Design an enzyme around this catalytic site. Structure first.
Site, mmCIF file in Angstrom:
data_model
loop_
_atom_site.group_PDB
_atom_site.id
_atom_site.type_symbol
_atom_site.label_atom_id
_atom_site.label_comp_id
_atom_site.label_asym_id
_atom_site.label_seq_id
_atom_site.Cartn_x
_atom_site.Cartn_y
_atom_site.Cartn_z
ATOM 1 N N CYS A 1 43.384 -29.620 -36.629
ATOM 2 C CA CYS A 1 44.385 -30.742 -37.082
ATOM 3 C C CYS A 1 43.952 -31.509 -38.032
ATOM 4 O O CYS A 1 42.842 -31.980 -38.058
ATOM 5 C CB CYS A 1 45.159 -31.275 -35.827
ATOM 6 S SG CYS A 1 45.711 -30.141 -34.641
ATOM 7 N N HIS B 1 48.501 -38.148 -33.668
ATOM 8 C CA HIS B 1 48.149 -37.899 -32.308
ATOM 9 C C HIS B 1 46.694 -37.975 -32.220
ATOM 10 O O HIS B 1 46.081 -37.894 -31.027
ATOM 11 C CB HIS B 1 48.598 -36.671 -31.753
ATOM 12 C CG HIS B 1 48.003 -35.494 -32.352
ATOM 13 N ND1 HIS B 1 48.758 -34.750 -33.303
ATOM 14 C CD2 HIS B 1 47.050 -34.608 -32.200
ATOM 15 C CE1 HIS B 1 47.883 -33.651 -33.581
ATOM 16 N NE2 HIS B 1 46.685 -33.618 -32.920
ATOM 17 N N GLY C 1 40.569 -28.527 -33.219
ATOM 18 C CA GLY C 1 39.956 -29.628 -34.249
ATOM 19 C C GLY C 1 40.114 -29.420 -35.451
ATOM 20 O O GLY C 1 40.116 -30.145 -36.505
HETATM 21 C C1 LIG Z 1 44.604 -29.284 -33.843
HETATM 22 C C2 LIG Z 1 43.689 -30.423 -33.221
HETATM 23 O O1 LIG Z 1 42.651 -31.103 -33.608
HETATM 24 N N1 LIG Z 1 44.159 -30.730 -31.839
HETATM 25 C C3 LIG Z 1 44.129 -32.338 -31.333
HETATM 26 C C4 LIG Z 1 44.641 -31.854 -30.164
HETATM 27 C C5 LIG Z 1 43.885 -30.794 -29.602
HETATM 28 C C6 LIG Z 1 44.571 -30.034 -30.649
HETATM 29 C C7 LIG Z 1 46.022 -30.171 -30.373
HETATM 30 N N2 LIG Z 1 46.130 -31.729 -30.068
HETATM 31 C C8 LIG Z 1 46.909 -31.868 -28.909
HETATM 32 C C9 LIG Z 1 48.500 -31.639 -29.179
HETATM 33 C C10 LIG Z 1 49.028 -31.024 -28.245
HETATM 34 C C11 LIG Z 1 50.405 -30.768 -28.597
HETATM 35 C C12 LIG Z 1 51.116 -31.472 -29.898
HETATM 36 C C13 LIG Z 1 50.326 -31.944 -30.687
HETATM 37 CL CL1 LIG Z 1 50.885 -32.497 -32.079
HETATM 38 C C14 LIG Z 1 49.104 -32.094 -30.512
#
Ligand SMILES: *CC(=O)N1C[C@@H]2C[C@H]1CN2Cc1cccc(Cl)c1
Ligand SMILES: *CC(=O)N1C[C@@H]2C[C@H]1CN2Cc1cccc(Cl)c1
Lengths: 304, 304
Positions: free
Chosen positions: B145, B41, B143
């Site tokens: 992820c 993603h 951030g």
């Molecule tokens: C955790 C991280 O870096 N992120 C990337 C974007 C903002 C946050 C979550 N991500 C969007 C997202 C929404 C729903 C499902 C998934 Cl897999 C990602």
């Protein structure tokens, strides 16, 4: 979201851990620049530990008696000295992995991470707090001495603790990196009792703010209190007295949540008087006191 | 002595964390050998997240669109591919800090450490368990992820998790390092509910053995039970059923303490039926289930 007992990334400290052997005793050392720091009781035998005279014991030791191994390689010892309860072993090689560092003597209530080591090798990392009675509730087995406590600010490691001993009650005592013990403890195999282990009130409040930020708000009540009224309750439950210095440090948390510090104190007061009633806060059935207001802000903001 | 929620030393994983940016989205990547692994993603905008067609989105992306930075230096991307929910970015440089590693898909109940990262930089390390509903209760902000879960056996890092998302309930979901989600979750901004978060019975028993080893024995009773009788109680309290496989794995703990597994099950049964009565076990007022029998043996023996 989510709230965890989080330790600092331990890599910068892992690159400093060495094994120090003197005679038949092996413990951990901290190698920073061309100096290896370790507990002075590395020169003791089990017989010596009962009533050691470290100055007298150290006279029988030369540089070649201190065996320092970093990984599978031996460091050459070119000088030794005792500074309070730590030995400083001057080696001929500067540690190439020496991070930017400082030696800090922390106050009770302050938290830090411990990299538990055995034979100079890291086994685990966990988050601790220096208790108000100057003990830490760690996880240390024989051979863990010389393991260190630290905090990290961006690239600088602030070493605050070195593990020396376990009291007969299973709690832990040690020094700062200048060899001065936290508390009245001495490096001797004699029964030493710890004082009252009170709860770090400012930390509990910080953790209640962390709980509100993360959605656990059931404990919030319609009440407020005063610093003097709260402290009457805190004294009764063996909680540390809260000062305006503590209120000041909770200010950013109070601002973020819109919950005045004294209103949070009133919620804490009712929690102390009524208990949790079988409920939990941040997955805990007791009030957590090993998160400072700085830890809560750091974790809730993502400081790397 | 002492028992702590301990994470693996994170140094070997810190040397693998990089920052990956695609368009305006920046998350963490794991650099092992000449491949950078990150959540797919990273190619999505907030608009795309609602109902993404990753294959269609990936067509509009070339190697030069993936910006990979390790420290302050940029890695050159010479290939890209999607494997399930992760992107593999082939870079022209092998990571010089690549530890010995394996990719493992863990079972529910298994624990691991998470190195929470932001912008490719580590912020903290904590110990997690893969819940029986295939979620983890982490501490992850936007951030985070691409941050990974892992276990370490001497010098080999077994990567088991990569963080992808937070469910609307504040619990976390992610994949193994082959991009396959744990549980039924999909990488889409759609409400996905988690199933019943049951308690990891074998882990609670392991932690009760850890408590006995460390001196907390008040909960021990004069009773025993059978696997079928215990499981009737476990089903009622939303505890996972205990099998003879679980009894087998508790064998070394049963041997060390001399407490038969079924006698410990009877102590657990009374704790479930009567509660803690305001008491604590290893400084906890609830039954801890995020220590496996392997974790207890490891910590109580000092495996480095
Ligand atoms: C955790 C991280 O870096 N992120 C990337 C974007 C903002 C946050 C979550 N991500 C969007 C997202 C929404 C729903 C499902 C998934 Cl897999 C990602
Ligand atoms: C922790 C560690 O490595 N050690 C070295 C020896 C065994 C264990 C404790 N040490 C003996 C000791 C007894 C009483 C007080 C002190 Cl400071 C040390």
């Amino acid at each position: 979201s989510g709230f965890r007992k989080m330790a600092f990334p331990s890599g910068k400290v892992e690159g400093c851990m060495v094994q120090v052997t003197c005679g038949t005793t092996t413990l951990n050392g901290l190698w920073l620049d061309d100096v290896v720091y370790c507990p002075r009781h590395v020169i003791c035998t089990s017989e010596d530990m009962l009533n050691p005279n470290y100055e007298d014991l150290l006279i029988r030791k030369s540089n070649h008696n201190f065996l320092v191994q970093a990984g599978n390689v031996q460091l050459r010892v070119i000088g030794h000295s005792m500074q309070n309860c730590v030995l400083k072993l001057k080696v001929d090689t500067a540690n190439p992995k020496t991070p930017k560092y400082k030696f800090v003597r922390i106050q009770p209530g302050q938290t830090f991470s411990v990299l538990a080591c055995y034979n100079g090798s890291p086994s685990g990392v966990y988050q601790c707090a220096m208790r108000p009675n100057f003990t830490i509730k760690g996880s240390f087995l024989n051979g863990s001495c010389g393991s260190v406590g630290f905090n990290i600010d961006y690239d600088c490691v602030s070493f605050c603790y070195m593990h020396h001993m376990e009291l007969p009650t299973g709690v832990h005592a040690g020094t700062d990196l200048e060899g001065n013990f936290y508390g009245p403890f001495v490096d001797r195999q004699t029964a030493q009792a710890a004082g009252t282990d009170t709860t770090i009130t400012v930390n509990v409040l910080a953790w209640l703010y962390a709980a509100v930020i993360n959605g656990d708000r059931w404990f919030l009540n319609r009440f407020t209190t005063t610093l003097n009224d709260f402290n009457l309750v805190a004294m009764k439950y063996n909680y540390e007295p809260l000062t305006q210095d503590h209120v000041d440090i909770l200010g950013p948390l109070s601002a973020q949540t819109g919950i005045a510090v004294l209103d949070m104190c009133a919620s804490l007061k009712e929690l102390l008087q009524n208990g949790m009633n079988g409920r939990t806060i941040l997955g805990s059935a007791l009030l957590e006191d090993e998160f400072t207001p700085f830890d809560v802000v750091r974790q809730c903001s993502g400081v790397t």
